[PDB]
Amino acid sequence: HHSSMEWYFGKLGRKDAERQLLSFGNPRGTFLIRESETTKGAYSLSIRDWDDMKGDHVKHYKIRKLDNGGYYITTRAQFETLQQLVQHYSERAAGLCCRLVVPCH
């Protein structure tokens, strides 16, 4: 088992996740993963986005845990590890609001 993340923030709530992502100058696609605040055992993917109405804001996606191991945001794209999920969505949005461009600095 290889043991190894800048983008993982542990027990960080939604509000404090948004404060870190909305730091000045971070692009759309700045992101982090944290424990879910409202579904125990799951994770949350928090991504900086922009639209004309909301301006700079954060979108949150539930990363669900498969009962017997692994992770997904949509059931048709499953991953063994959070690292593999992040690498996948760094390469293509594939339904997310945008790609995972840079871990929250």
Binding site: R14, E37, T38, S44, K59, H60, Y61, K62, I73, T74, R76, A77, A94, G95, L96, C97
Partner: peptide
């Protein structure tokens, strides 16, 4: 209960 986004599915 807070808002979470979902990946849209298209047929």
């Amino acid at each position: 209960e807070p808002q979470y986004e979902e990946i849209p599915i298209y047929l």
